[PDB]
Design a protein around this ligand. Structure first.
Ligand SMILES: OC[C@H]1O[C@@](CO)(O[C@H]2O[C@H](CO)[C@@H](O)[C@H](O)[C@H]2O)[C@@H](O)[C@@H]1O
Ligand SMILES: OC[C@H]1O[C@@](CO)(O[C@H]2O[C@H](CO)[C@@H](O)[C@H](O)[C@H]2O)[C@@H](O)[C@@H]1O
Ligand SMILES: OC[C@H]1O[C@@](CO)(O[C@H]2O[C@H](CO)[C@@H](O)[C@H](O)[C@H]2O)[C@@H](O)[C@@H]1O
Ligand SMILES: OC[C@H]1O[C@@](CO)(O[C@H]2O[C@H](CO)[C@@H](O)[C@H](O)[C@H]2O)[C@@H](O)[C@@H]1O
Ligand code: NA
Ligand code: NA
Ligand SMILES: [Zn+2]
Ligand SMILES: [Zn+2]
Ligand SMILES: [Zn+2]
Ligand SMILES: [Zn+2]
Lengths: 416, 416
């Protein structure tokens, strides 16, 4: 019982302290970090990292916190990193969060707030019953919780504290980073990979037990402008050209089923975001997504070919194409160092956790960092229902996440 | 030569006086008439009508001028009317018009303005050469001319002056009206049909020689709102519903060739005016037009049926239809008194004019007046290139228009 007692206690102590700090980010601010709460949280973590005993504890002028757990081995082991973000979602308030601890959960509905009649139900959240017997933490219904990503951050702190206090567990050098403004898309913008100094890293910002993510979409955006000629409707024969119809003609050339509303898993798509215009001019916006690089390029070429075909029919000025790549599949950067996914998978299996591979049907900080030279899979944290008042987390699962971090560290050293 | 000498002289004298008065209308004004120039023109015409010798010469508080040519017959003849509008187009300035008289026209290009290099060419206007030998009046390239509709108005004045001075030509009572704000769509709004007191009338607001119009579109307008559900693209399967695609699905059910850009003559259509929206909501505007009443109603029912079909597929709230009739085919009102078209046709043939029937692929003041209880065909005036700096008119054709008015009046009396 000793190991679990110590870990559960510490997880709850740190997590409840962190969620009580307002760290919501705000895109309307242009400082880095965007909100002062992130600076308060960072300064608190700097002191916590120093008290645990990590070295090289820094917080840069942009609020990025980094620290080192020195190697504890005679072997040459790659430097590995663990990452988490400081901020909470812009969707709902993260101010004055009142965490509620529900031990030995019965798997039934939880009344978060009697006065406001706010109830967390299994009907609305079918995964709720699977947490029977766990210790879960919820909000009081008036705020989100911030398990995304204070649960992952807590797990890193608890795992580092465990390692430094268990020198019999050998490991190479480990770097940790706590970063601002992930929720507004600015996290990687000021992440200094050279300063971080790791070969690869694990982002602790997944969700439920077993989550492992390391593949993401290739992405491009396109804007099509169609130009026509308006005339009085009555005298339009062989003179009028309806730009809106040209837009519909363009869309008609795309495979109807290759759209987000019909696809999942690794299936790609074309997605029509908007169409605005009239007879004289119409503008359509699309995104193009595919996990397979060859097929992604083929989707872009399909658009080019349709445009060429319509320009030959209506003239070069009738169709104008703006198209630019946006981001790429992180698997391309993981492949040369694929053992980093194998070690995470093996770590989970060794702890009797069934891994759940989740393709990232979009882009994340981990997928962008991968592109920047820091291959970074995303690992589960135990959180559910992120970005709203019904957010909750299983402390039992948080403990499993800590165990995974420890096992990954030991495994890199053992295999070196 | 006497008849033609007198008529050409008078046509040019009156027409050139009228075009020099700025009578452009302005929709931004909400007085009736919208501009003071129309009041000046009306007051001038009241005095001109009195000097010709017409009776019951009135100008109401809204600027509508009416007058009577008393019957000159012992027979019971229906009261017939002749109409023209006071205002010029909003498209180009009608201020300080400088009419140019080109006698014995050679059918070649006319330099309207040497200083600004403005030239009226047969390449740009292929009908120009057909006027070889005529006396034509043009602008100086800095204004429009106002033949629309001061040519028709002049023709009415010259015809009434001719009738009163030729009492040997028998006719029933004739009423004339000169109306403001036709060019901004407000003419019929304050036209008092009861006060006008005619069974039917002829609008002198056609164009080239032989023009005769008495059939117009039935019309309805529709606005379709499509409602969908937006989601993150990556997690859209069986959740997202793209409103813009619903709009395209709706349009796809309509016959592609039944559109203004592929139709002429009596062919009807559906016309997509605009489409604006995104995944959550999209709005399309259409007009529906058909000369045949049964087919017009069938087009409306087709739209209703498509909406019903889509509501059964997606739910009642997914598609919202606003649809209202706008105006109707004047032929329905002409049919009970069809002899009024026969008399105009016969009048033209008797003067060796080949009638040119022009379906009205829209709505006009004549078609709206018909609906209001005053069946009103539109007769040619001799004007070409209306609403711009290249507007011109054939005085030879103006003379033919005067002859047509006279013949129509005599013919009603002869057939009574
Ligand atoms: O041979 C490359 C070709 O193979 C595809 C699958 O048809 O992708 C495979 O190879 C990629 C490049 O090494 C891997 O990243 C990918 O995971 C693998 O399936 C095509 O996409 C690619 O053009
Ligand atoms: O640690 C992986 C990370 O480092 C970079 C830096 O250039 O690549 C290095 O490591 C790769 C994996 O072993 C080698 O293939 C490569 O030659 C070496 O430069 C990044 O490209 C990569 O993401
Ligand atoms: O029988 C009426 C029926 O005939 C159509 C032609 O198919 O129209 C004709 O009859 C109308 C009603 O009297 C006329 O106005 C029209 O000009 C004539 O062609 C249908 O439109 C109508 O339903
Ligand atoms: O002058 C035609 C005009 O008068 C109205 C007025 O009611 O109809 C009258 O004349 C018709 C044509 O002879 C008759 O069929 C009708 O009964 C009579 O009232 C208008 O309806 C019509 O446009
Ligand atoms: Na994304
Ligand atoms: Na019209
Ligand atoms: Zn997160
Ligand atoms: Zn988040
Ligand atoms: Zn006119
Ligand atoms: Zn006009």
């Amino acid at each position: 019982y000793f190991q679990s007692n110590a870990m559960k206690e510490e997880l709850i102590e740190r997590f409840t302290r962190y969620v009580k700090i307002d760290t919501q980010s705000n895109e309307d601010s242009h400082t880095v970090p965007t909100t002062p709460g992130q600076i308060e949280f960072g300064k608190l973590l700097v002191e916590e990292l120093k008290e645990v005993g990590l070295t090289e504890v820094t917080m840069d002028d942009n609020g990025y916190v980094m620290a080192t757990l020195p190697a504890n081995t005679d072997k040459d082991v790659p430097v590995i990193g663990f990452l988490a973000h400081l901020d909470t979602a812009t969707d709902f308030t993260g101010k004055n969060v009142k965490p509620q601890i529900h031990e030995n959960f019965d798997g039934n509905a939880i009344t978060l707030n009697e006065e406001l009649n706010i109830v967390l139900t299994p009907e609305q959240f079918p995964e709720l019953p699977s947490y029977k017997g766990h210790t879960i933490i919820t909000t009081d219904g008036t705020t989100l919780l911030g398990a995304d990503d204070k649960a992952g951050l807590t797990e890193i702190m608890v795992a580092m504290n465990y390692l430094i206090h268990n020198p019999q567990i050998k490991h190479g050098k480990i770097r940790v980073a706590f970063t601002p403004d992930e929720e507004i898309g600015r996290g990687p913008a000021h992440f200094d990979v050279e300063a971080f100094g790791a070969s690869f890293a694990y982002m602790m910002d997944g969700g439920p037990l077993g989550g492992l993510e390391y593949e993401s979409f290739n992405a491009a955006g396109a804007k099509l402008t169609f130009n026509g000629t308006n005339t009085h409707p009555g005298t339009a024969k062989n003179k009028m050209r309806n730009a809106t119809k040209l837009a519909m003609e363009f869309n008609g050339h795309l495979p109807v089923e290759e759209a987000p509303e019909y696809t999942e898993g690794y299936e790609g798509f074309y997605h029509l975001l908007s169409l605005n215009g009239d007879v004289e001019q119409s503008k359509a916006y699309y995104i193009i997504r595919d996990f397979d690089r060859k097929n992604f390029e083929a989707r872009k070429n399909t658009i080019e070919n349709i445009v060429k075909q319509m320009q030959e029919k209506y003239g070069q000025d009738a169709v104008v194409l703006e198209m630019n790549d946006q981001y790429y599949n992180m698997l391309e950067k993981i492949e040369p160092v694929r053992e980093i996914v194998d070690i995470a998978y093996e770590a989970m299996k060794s702890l009797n956790i069934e891994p759940n591979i989740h393709p990232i049907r979009g882009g994340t900080d981990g997928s962008q960092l991968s592109y920047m030279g820091l291959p970074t899979p995303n690992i589960f944290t135990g959180g559910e229902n992120y970005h709203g008042k019904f957010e909750y987390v299983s402390v039992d699962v948080m403990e499993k996440a800590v165990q995974v971090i420890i096992e990954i560290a030991r495994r890199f050293e053992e295999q070196a």
